[PDB]
Amino acid sequence: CLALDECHGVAANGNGLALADKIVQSMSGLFRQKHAFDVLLVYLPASWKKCFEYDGFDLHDRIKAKVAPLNLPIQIINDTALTRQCRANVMWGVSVALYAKAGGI
Amino acid sequence: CLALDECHGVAANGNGLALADKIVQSMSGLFRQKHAFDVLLVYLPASWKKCFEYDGFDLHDRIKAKVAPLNLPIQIINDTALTRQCRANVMWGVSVALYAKAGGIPWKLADWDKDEAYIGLSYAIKKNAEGQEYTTCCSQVFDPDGTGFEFVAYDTRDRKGNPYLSYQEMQSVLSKSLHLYQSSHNGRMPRKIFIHKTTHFTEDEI
Amino acid sequence: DRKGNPYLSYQEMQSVLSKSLHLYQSSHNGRMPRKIFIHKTTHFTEDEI
Amino acid sequence: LTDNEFYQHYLQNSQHMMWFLGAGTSRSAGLPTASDIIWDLKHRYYCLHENQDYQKHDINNHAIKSKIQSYMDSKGFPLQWSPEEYSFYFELVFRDDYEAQRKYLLEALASRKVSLNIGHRVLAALLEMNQTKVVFTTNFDDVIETAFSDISGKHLSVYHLEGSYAALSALNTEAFPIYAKIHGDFRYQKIKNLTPDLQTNDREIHKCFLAAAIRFGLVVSGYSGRDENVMTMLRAAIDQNNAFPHGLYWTVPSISKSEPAVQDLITYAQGKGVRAYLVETGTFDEMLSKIWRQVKDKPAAIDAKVRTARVCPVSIPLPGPGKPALRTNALPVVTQSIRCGVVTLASPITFSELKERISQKSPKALLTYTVLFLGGEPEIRKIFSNDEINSIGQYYIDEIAQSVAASTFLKSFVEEAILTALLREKPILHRVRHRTHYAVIPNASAKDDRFLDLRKAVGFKGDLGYITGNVTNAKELSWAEAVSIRLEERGGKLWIMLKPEIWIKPLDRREEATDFIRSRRRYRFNQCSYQILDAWIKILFGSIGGGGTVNISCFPDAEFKAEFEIGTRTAFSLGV
Amino acid sequence: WRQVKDKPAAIDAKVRTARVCPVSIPLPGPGKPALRTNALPVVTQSIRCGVVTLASP
Amino acid sequence: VLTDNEFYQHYLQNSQHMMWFL
Amino acid sequence: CSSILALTKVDWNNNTLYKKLPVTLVYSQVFADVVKQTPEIVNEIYDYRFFM
RNA sequence: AUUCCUGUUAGAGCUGUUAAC
DNA sequence: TAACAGCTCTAACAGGAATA
RNA sequence: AUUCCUGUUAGAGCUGUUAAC
DNA sequence: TAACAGCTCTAACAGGAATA
Ligand SMILES: Nc1ncnc2c1ncn2[C@@H]1O[C@H](COP(=O)(O)O)[C@@H](O)[C@H]1O
Numbered sequence A: 001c002l003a004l005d006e007c008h009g010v011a012a013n014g015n016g017l018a019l020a021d022k023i024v025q026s027m028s029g030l031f032r033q034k035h036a037f038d039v040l041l042v043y044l045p046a047s048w049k050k051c052f053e054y055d056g057f058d059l060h061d062r063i064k065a066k067v068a069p070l071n072l073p074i075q076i077i078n079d080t081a082l083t084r085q086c087r088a089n090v091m092w093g094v095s096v097a098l099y100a101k102a103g104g105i
Numbered sequence B: 001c002l003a004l005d006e007c008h009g010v011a012a013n014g015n016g017l018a019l020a021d022k023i024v025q026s027m028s029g030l031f032r033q034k035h036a037f038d039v040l041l042v043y044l045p046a047s048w049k050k051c052f053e054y055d056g057f058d059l060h061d062r063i064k065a066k067v068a069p070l071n072l073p074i075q076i077i078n079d080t081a082l083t084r085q086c087r088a089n090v091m092w093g094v095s096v097a098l099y100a101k102a103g104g105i106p107w108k109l110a111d112w113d114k115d116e117a118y119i120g121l122s123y124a125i126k127k128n129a130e131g132q133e134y135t136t137c138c139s140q141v142f143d144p145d146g147t148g149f150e151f152v153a154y155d156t157r158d159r160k161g162n163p164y165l166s167y168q169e170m171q172s173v174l175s176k177s178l179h180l181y182q183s184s185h186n187g188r189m190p191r192k193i194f195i196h197k198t199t200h201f202t203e204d205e206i
Numbered sequence C: 001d002r003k004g005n006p007y008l009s010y011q012e013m014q015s016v017l018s019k020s021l022h023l024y025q026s027s028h029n030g031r032m033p034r035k036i037f038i039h040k041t042t043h044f045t046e047d048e049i
Numbered sequence D: 001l002t003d004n005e006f007y008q009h010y011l012q013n014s015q016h017m018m019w020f021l022g023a024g025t026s027r028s029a030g031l032p033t034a035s036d037i038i039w040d041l042k043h044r045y046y047c048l049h050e051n052q053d054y055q056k057h058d059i060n061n062h063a064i065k066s067k068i069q070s071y072m073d074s075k076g077f078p079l080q081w082s083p084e085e086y087s088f089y090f091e092l093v094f095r096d097d098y099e100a101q102r103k104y105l106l107e108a109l110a111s112r113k114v115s116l117n118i119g120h121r122v123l124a125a126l127l128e129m130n131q132t133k134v135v136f137t138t139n140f141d142d143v144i145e146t147a148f149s150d151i152s153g154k155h156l157s158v159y160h161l162e163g164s165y166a167a168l169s170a171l172n173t174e175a176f177p178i179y180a181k182i183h184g185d186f187r188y189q190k191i192k193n194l195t196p197d198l199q200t201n202d203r204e205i206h207k208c209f210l211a212a213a214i215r216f217g218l219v220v221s222g223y224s225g226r227d228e229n230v231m232t233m234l235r236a237a238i239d240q241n242n243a244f245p246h247g248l249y250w251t252v253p254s255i256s257k258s259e260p261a262v263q264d265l266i267t268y269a270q271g272k273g274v275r276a277y278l279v280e281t282g283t284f285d286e287m288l289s290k291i292w293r294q295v296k297d298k299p300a301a302i303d304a305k306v307r308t309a310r311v312c313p314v315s316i317p318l319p320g321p322g323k324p325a326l327r328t329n330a331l332p333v334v335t336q337s338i339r340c341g342v343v344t345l346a347s348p349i350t351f352s353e354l355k356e357r358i359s360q361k362s363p364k365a366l367l368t369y370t371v372l373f374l375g376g377e378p379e380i381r382k383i384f385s386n387d388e389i390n391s392i393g394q395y396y397i398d399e400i401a402q403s404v405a406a407s408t409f410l411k412s413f414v415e416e417a418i419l420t421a422l423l424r425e426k427p428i429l430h431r432v433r434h435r436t437h438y439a440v441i442p443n444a445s446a447k448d449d450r451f452l453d454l455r456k457a458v459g460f461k462g463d464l465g466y467i468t469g470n471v472t473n474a475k476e477l478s479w480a481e482a483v484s485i486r487l488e489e490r491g492g493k494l495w496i497m498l499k500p501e502i503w504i505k506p507l508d509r510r511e512e513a514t515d516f517i518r519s520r521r522r523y524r525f526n527q528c529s530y531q532i533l534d535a536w537i538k539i540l541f542g543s544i545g546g547g548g549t550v551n552i553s554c555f556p557d558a559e560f561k562a563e564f565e566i567g568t569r570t571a572f573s574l575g576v
Numbered sequence E: 001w002r003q004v005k006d007k008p009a010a011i012d013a014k015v016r017t018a019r020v021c022p023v024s025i026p027l028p029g030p031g032k033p034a035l036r037t038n039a040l041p042v043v044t045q046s047i048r049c050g051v052v053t054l055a056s057p
Numbered sequence F: 001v002l003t004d005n006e007f008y009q010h011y012l013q014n015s016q017h018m019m020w021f022l
Numbered sequence G: 001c002s003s004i005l006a007l008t009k010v011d012w013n014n015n016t017l018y019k020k021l022p023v024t025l026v027y028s029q030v031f032a033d034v035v036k037q038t039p040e041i042v043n044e045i046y047d048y049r050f051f052m
Numbered sequence H, J: 001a002u003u004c005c006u007g008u009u010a011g012a013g014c015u016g017u018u019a020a021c
Numbered sequence I, K: 001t002a003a004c005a006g007c008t009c010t011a012a013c014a015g016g017a018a019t020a
């Protein structure tokens, strides 16, 4: 799926709540095919940093709490996982997280 | 979008398959812009009624069968929805249909058990030149561990002359149903399964 | 409902612990747990104990 | 009537107080309520006829509850939580078989699932220690009986419907405490739980309640009305001379959700001249917890069972040091008793006031409030004039560890005293960050021989290191080795905590050197940290950590001097 | 056994009450807004009739 | 005489102590 | 009986109170028509929101 | 095809009972 | 395999709108 | 937010000890 | 209820990578 371009406008506006709501609302195309996939890899560009963490808010927790009742596991990926010097670190972490969220144990 | 002109021409030819393919190619301008819109509203004028329904072909059925693999919902609108006197009836119908096609859930069964899956098998007739063809497909209406609930249908499949699934075919479709239910509930068994068939179950089928 | 301090009262601690062993019983076909470990980042008041 | 005034009224006259507990206390005792019993009966009934696996589906699930209730409504049964339902479902399941009904009600409310909580134990303690004499109940299970047996260690006299008249005699001969169940134990043939049985009252129990009305005042808790026989018995008890000498205190967990029957009964009682009051005190458990809290001179023997958390568990002893051994940073202070000076003020003083007087005067002494001063009297005379000083005497702290543990002021005072003593005769500078004390190598005297060992500690590959200097990329920040020194109270012992740190000369500009502080501390591994800790021990004590008992006194030339003695070897313990 | 409670997993796996092929669930009692159906009962449990024998199929 | 369902109820209420003669 | 009765009420395509059949039966029939018209659908399973 | 499923006109598939091949 | 009986369902059309 | 917890800057929460009200 | 003492926690940032 593709995130709405309105997410960029909200991020420029610096509104975390509306940004999380828009990210969740972008998931309808996948929700019509919820049976198809097991784990959803939500990516956030660095341009949204202004809404990643500020007072009285946290985007990651809001997204997790919004998609928890919808039963779809989500593996959030930031640019940090991309630019971390080592690669086996990120690969091991992401792979074990992916296996745990799709199935378990 | 606008329906491409040749469709009108093929309306004279009485070729349902050509009309459906031409409509799909007309909507092909919307393949790239899937993110922009959620529901497409295809309108079929009364002038196309000659290709609406005829032996061995269903226009809405063919259109939706062609568009479903492309993953974009349509709510086909004909002159009926416009004609129909009581406006509130049609408005409730279209509003609920569009909201549910977008991805929302207008309503759910109150206090529905999430550990029971209700299977339902049905069939349809294809009038072959030499014999008959029975198309059997299954559906599931279970409720996943989340708050929303699922509703998915699939074919039971090479050739069938009777609507009674054999041992192999029935166990295959039920195993596929079991995997479908497992995928939603982290892998938990369904504690109770309901199967609604339009015809009686055979000894081998049970 | 609201908590002004991170220390659970008598009723809230009892309710949480009740939910916990009821969950265990559901996952253990009703068998009672024999050892219970309650790890807390802060000290248990008299009410919690 | 506000709850606090009710508590004061009850505490004022607690020797004459009947209690009335029907089906409300049992909710918190670990046994099923009326609604839980109804739902269990519905579960058995549905699973029986419609052949369904009993254990496959639970009862507290919302979906299964809705399905069973829909089935019940399908056969025309009562709809939802309505009167004549509990008795209806009992008489439906058991088809007028009172023996089987009794056996089921015994099994559901049996004495194996019951876990007494604070409320029942507190009430049983009130019974034993003889404040409340009569405890009427409409409840079948032996929660109060078990609580009294657990706390008092004595058998409790429970009264029921079998004997019936037994309770009245006990009242007349003052055989307190009496615990009369208005609906009787389930161990007997008559239970009086169905609606048809709930319209009548036993004559002798009725007479007993009427007679007990005059003697005591009633507190009724966990009772929501809905019973006609008990309501009419209470109304008849009201309609007699001096019906309640101490007033009927009807308590509900919530005044808003209280049934109108209770309120109209309260109004009728007030119209009949009694001082009956309806109060809200939260749950029964919290009410009884507060009531026990306000109880004075509770016996220790029964209170050791009323509040098992009050006694200290987990006093698991530690083994010996017999038979690799970690070497901590704790220096044991074996000093047990110290001497301090006390000044008596003509007017009350505040610890803040003394702190600001310290800030202004800056004397060569220590003071704290509890005013205990350590140092010379003339310094205190500088701080406090003769007019505000009444007398100056001595104070002895026989148990230092217990004293510092009890009062944090003593902890801070003793920590400051030991810090001043340790840095009294040494060139190492004494600073403070937040509420901690730091002994830091001075900038000028960094070339001392007593620092050379420390110079060896920080050195790389055995060469000569650096102890003080300037940051690599800071405009004016200056850095030095230092040790954070603290006082830790562990059990019945006091220890000195030393932690190696990198002190920064500007207090508020420490973060700008963070990387440096990180960079200098990247490779301070176990060997290097061991060396630095040994060097700091040598600097602070003057003796190596083998078999030493160096003693240090603060203000040795002062009349009030504190003489501590700290073992020079840090704590260690060989593995078992 | 289908209504005995708190049974270990191994035992239920062992027995599982086999499987019920010939489903037969009891009809409830007649009981007492009734519905009137169109069905008229026939209580003639047996009738007499004639047979003719043919020399050819 | 008694209906089988009430017999089942009585057996299930007290099955810890009931014989079985075959 | 209760399962079927409740199932005849969650047909979003239907704008009336209920149906004659559970939604399982009607959607299986609809997808049976869809598959009969188009044989190249047998491989994949589809949600109800497409064909409703 | 906003929907609902009532009718009409037909055919098929299941069972059976015969006749056999 | 060819009839016959019943049960049941879908295939194509047509068709009006919820106590009058 | 693949992770980890090392520090910095702050505030609270509990205990207390006084002075009260 | 107002300060004061200690013990411990989280709330925001910043931040570099396993004995060299
Ligand atoms: N923890 C509690 N403390 C005091 N009263 C309670 C408590 N829990 C329930 N009740 C009361 O008990 C009543 C139920 O008793 P009954 O329904 O007559 O068996 C409720 O209406 C509550 O007011």
Ligand SMILES: [Mg+2]
Pocket: B075, B097, G013, G052
């Ligand atoms: Mg539709």
